[PDB]
Amino acid sequence: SHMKDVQTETFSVAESIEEISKANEEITNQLLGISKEMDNISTRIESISASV
Amino acid sequence: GSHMKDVQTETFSVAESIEEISKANEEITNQLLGISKEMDNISTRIESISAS
Amino acid sequence: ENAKNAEEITNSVKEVNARLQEISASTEEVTSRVQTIRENVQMLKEIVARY
Amino acid sequence: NAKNAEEITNSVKEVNARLQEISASTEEVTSRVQTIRENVQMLKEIVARYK
């Protein structure tokens, strides 16, 4: 049965696509918090330009 | 080998997709390098403006 | 100098915001192409059972 | 200006930390795409051999 070398490689991409999937969610969580924190720095710099 | 022809149909979609993820994660890493160098400039300039 | 530095920081923030929206799009591109590889690795483990 | 330059120095410091963790996860996707790319070259030889 030649479904041996199909199984050994379709096991390695399944333990690896899983960490990719998790890492894409962790990147997503950081990114959307950073856009909010960045948009508050934008207000503070605008206040400094006004102050100048 | 018809069951290996079934395997090719799957393995074509994976090979097309992994080549896009390979360029998309290189586009992310280069943009992240550019953000960091600008963030160190904001860090640097926010100490010099405070001394000013 | 305070006018110069304020604009220099504003110009860096504009760069960061533009590169960050390109990374969100590329993250959505990877979040779409991860699902395509997951389906063709579950539908391929179905062949491994069939035979 | 002193109270806003301090609040930016502290938010920039947390942003840079959070950004260094995106660089970490992006390295971890980059490193596991080497595994997957290698295994879809192998899946191609076995089909060529036995189709």
Side-chain angles (χ1 to χ4, degrees):
Chain A
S1 186
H2 298 300
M3 296 295 166
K4 182 205 183 306
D5 289 289
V6 187
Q7 190 180 58
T8 55
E9 307 323 296
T10 313
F11 200 66
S12 304
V13 304
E15 61 186 11
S16 304
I17 206 69
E18 203 62 272
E19 300 194 69
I20 299 176
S21 304
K22 220 283 178 169
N24 278 260
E25 189 170 289
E26 298 290 298
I27 291 170
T28 305
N29 279 280
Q30 295 285 21
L31 191 142
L32 301 170
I34 292 170
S35 64
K36 289 181 172 183
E37 190 87 60
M38 285 299 301
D39 182 62
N40 292 331
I41 296 170
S42 192
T43 307
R44 298 305 193 200
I45 199 66
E46 186 169 296
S47 299
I48 293 168
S49 295
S51 194
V52 176
Chain B
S2 300
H3 310 285
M4 303 307 288
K5 184 174 65 67
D6 291 333
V7 174
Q8 182 66 266
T9 303
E10 312 296 335
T11 305
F12 182 91
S13 186
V14 179
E16 199 268 307
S17 298
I18 203 64
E19 181 181 302
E20 187 163 296
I21 302 178
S22 298
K23 176 59 154 62
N25 277 104
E26 196 176 313
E27 298 283 295
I28 294 167
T29 301
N30 286 329
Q31 296 292 40
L32 287 171
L33 213 170
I35 297 174
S36 195
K37 294 279 186 164
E38 294 295 317
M39 203 61 63
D40 200 49
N41 187 53
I42 298 169
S43 188
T44 310
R45 303 287 181 167
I46 207 76
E47 187 157 298
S48 286
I49 202 178
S50 198
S52 193
Chain C
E1 286 277 306
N2 298 343
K4 179 175 72 183
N5 282 276
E7 195 173 312
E8 195 72 72
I9 294 168
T10 303
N11 283 329
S12 286
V13 171
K14 285 174 164 180
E15 199 175 304
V16 175
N17 292 337
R19 297 189 194 271
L20 196 66
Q21 186 58 53
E22 199 200 285
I23 294 168
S24 196
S26 297
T27 304
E28 187 181 283
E29 292 180 298
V30 179
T31 295
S32 293
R33 287 295 202 156
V34 73
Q35 296 176 88
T36 300
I37 296 177
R38 183 73 72 154
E39 187 196 280
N40 296 116
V41 162
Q42 296 187 258
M43 296 294 169
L44 182 54
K45 189 181 183 184
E46 189 72 57
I47 310 182
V48 181
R50 188 184 294 142
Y51 186 71
Chain D
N1 289 347
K3 295 166 178 175
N4 287 331
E6 194 165 279
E7 190 193 292
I8 290 169
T9 299
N10 285 315
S11 286
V12 170
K13 201 170 296 189
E14 201 174 73
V15 170
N16 192 54
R18 297 174 71 173
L19 183 66
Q20 290 175 118
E21 294 201 52
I22 297 174
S23 304
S25 288
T26 308
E27 188 174 67
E28 205 76 4
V29 178
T30 303
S31 199
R32 294 299 189 289
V33 164
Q34 302 206 121
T35 312
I36 302 176
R37 208 172 189 172
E38 186 174 277
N39 292 128
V40 76
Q41 192 59 247
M42 181 50 177
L43 292 172
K44 288 174 170 180
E45 190 176 310
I46 62 179
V47 172
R49 295 285 183 188
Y50 308 129
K51 193 176 80 181

